């Protein structure tokens, strides 16, 4: 699969996994952080010291 974003906080980049989201290693999309429906992505390797998130246009 390939989750690429660009518009987050990426500036343009290709989400990754796993990626630690808030102590929370999440080795996939979540969306925890959205109140619809879709499901984003961390685009560092350290969420928690990084601050810098994605989407995950996939299935
Ligand atoms: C998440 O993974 C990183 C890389 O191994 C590790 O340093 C960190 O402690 C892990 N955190 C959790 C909650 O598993």
């Known amino acids: 699969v390939l ?3 660009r518009g987050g906080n990426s ?4 989400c ?3 990626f630690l989201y808030n102590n ?3 080795t ?5 952080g959205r ?3 879709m499901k984003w ?7 928690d ?3 810098k998130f994605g989407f995950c246009p996939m299935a």
């Open 11 to 14: 500036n343009g980049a290709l």
């Open 41 to 47: 992505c961390g685009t560092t390797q350290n969420y």
């Open 28 to 32: 996939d999309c979540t969306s925890e």
């Open 24 to 26: 929370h290693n999440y």
């Open 49 to 51: 010291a990084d601050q």
């Open 16 to 18: 990754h996994f796993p």
């Open 3 to 5: 989750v690429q974003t």
């Open 35 to 37: 109140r619809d429906n």
